[PDB]
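Researcher: I've got a protein sequence and the SMILES for YLY. Could you write out the 3D structure of the bound complex as structure tokens? I'd like something to compare against our soaking experiments later this week.
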Amino acid sequence: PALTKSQTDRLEVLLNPKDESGKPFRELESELLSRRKKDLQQIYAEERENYLGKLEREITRFFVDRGFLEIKSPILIPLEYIERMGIDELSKQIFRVDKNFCLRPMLAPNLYNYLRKLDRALPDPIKIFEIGPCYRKESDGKEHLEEFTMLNFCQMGSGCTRENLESIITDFLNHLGIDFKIVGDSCMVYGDTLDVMHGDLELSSAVVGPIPLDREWGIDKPWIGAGFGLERLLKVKHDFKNIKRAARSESYYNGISTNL
Amino acid sequence: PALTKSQTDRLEVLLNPKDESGKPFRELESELLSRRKKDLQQIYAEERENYLGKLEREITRFFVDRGFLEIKSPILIPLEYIERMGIDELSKQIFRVDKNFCLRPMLAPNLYNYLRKLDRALPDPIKIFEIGPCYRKESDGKEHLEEFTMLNFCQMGSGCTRENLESIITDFLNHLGIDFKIVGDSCMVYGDTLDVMHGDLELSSAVVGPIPLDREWGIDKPWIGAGFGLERLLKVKHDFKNIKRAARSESYYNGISTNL
Ligand SMILES: C[C@@H]1CCN[C@@H]1C(=O)NCCCC[C@H](N)C(=O)OP(=O)(O)OC[C@H]1O[C@@H](n2cnc3c(N)ncnc32)[C@H](O)[C@@H]1O
Ligand SMILES: C[C@@H]1CCN[C@@H]1C(=O)NCCCC[C@H](N)C(=O)OP(=O)(O)OC[C@H]1O[C@@H](n2cnc3c(N)ncnc32)[C@H](O)[C@@H]1O
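Model: Sure. Here is the predicted complex with YLY in place.
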């Protein structure tokens, strides 16, 4: 008669946010299976784009159009970058590779290096961004992924104000159609941050520099910047209950169960 | 009087393929520094796109337009996938992470899984592709990167012929403006391959299935497929002498030295 907790977990795997007893499990499951197959058939017939890849392209266009240079830097980075980031906590979260390398947990160290290098070539202000994989060993699963995709944009030189930072953040999220509020906060690496929140979900940490860490990276100018999780953004935008629906995954494609 | 080998290495870092004694080092270096700064100033003023990101978007459009579903699957994969790929050589090249995981050296295992899963939902033939980071510990540096980007497209069910495989390969490279020849070859994992060559550079390995490995992955249909290195393609297309100019890098941006 009543659904078991296991049967309910199974149907919840198959349930999309848009979907609207005493029908048996097998018929509810069969109905959901049929709707999800059709969802995939529709993607496949019409658009064929992955949400994560698509979101990356749309964000890329946004920042290129606003004068930010698109970076593609290494994902596998020297372990020394972590120490030079002032990380020794987040330190338990580092995936190490070989004796000397690790999977980057953030984009900041490589973007510090690009900021310094490009200051020799490019006019003030220097505007750059990267979108790409980042990795953190994580105990949670509801808002945390071990493998995720971060956007980090930043500017250095003139115009590096808190007002300009907030304005970019605001134009960005309004462009994406994502509701937010900007709250003051802090963390170990940076300060002193602004946190961009969706209800109780952190979409972004943002910082108005300078900060004392800059000197370690050969940086001696004002800067502003923010990092956003693309899977968090997708999660809010598609109203996914679990962030795993927005991840690189063999179990979900565009938030649709692939176990059909 | 004559340039030292070190000075010549330095100028070669600064030399682009398009650039056309007895001028001293310092003046040749100063001239090249000036041209490279201007190259970066021009990217930054006009397009602002990274070559690797841009090539990915263009390839994505190509395959989406031809009816292939865009996949984004994990980069960090179970070590068991390597063994189930029949790899135990390429095995010394695997970057391991934790006891149970590794950085994927190829896209094939996750695409095998997607082929099987999607066969329950999608009409025949099933056409899919992924573009993304792959990792192999490598002794060479001239045509090999430890961190690279592979494209793998594939089809399963009807139309999985050698002729159709070659036609897609041909339309693809002609679209990209890349000269090639298709040669028969073989490797340990697959067969029996077709190798897509640019002079002596391998652009792609391609396979007409079925093969006995399929059964390990729950696959019992004809398939065709190919994997291309995006950095190899960029290398040919931009006439870069070294493939490091085409990599995710803090030393090169669009093949331009960032050490200016
Ligand atoms: C780049 C310049 C030069 C130096 N630094 C500058 C800069 O711009 N700094 C300003 C702040 C940038 C971001 C900072 N480095 C950072 O890593 O912030 P976090 O808050 O730790 O990560 C940013 C976002 O990534 C997402 N994220 C985090 N961990 C996860 C997870 N495990 N699963 C899924 N999503 C997650 C989440 O949305 C989070 O708000
Ligand atoms: C996906 C379906 C389901 C199962 N398999 C199917 C399939 O489509 N198989 C057909 C063949 C696909 C490719 C095969 N798995 C593979 O890994 O081929 P490789 O030749 O080892 O790699 C393909 C290309 O990646 C590039 N590449 C390689 N190593 C490097 C390097 N270290 N640095 C830079 N570039 C490199 C290089 O261009 C090479 O030609």
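Model: The helical segments of chain A are 5-14, 25-45, 51-65, 80-84, 108-118, 162-176, 230-238. Chain A has two domains: 1-48, 49-260.
Researcher: Great, I'll pass this along to the crystallography team.
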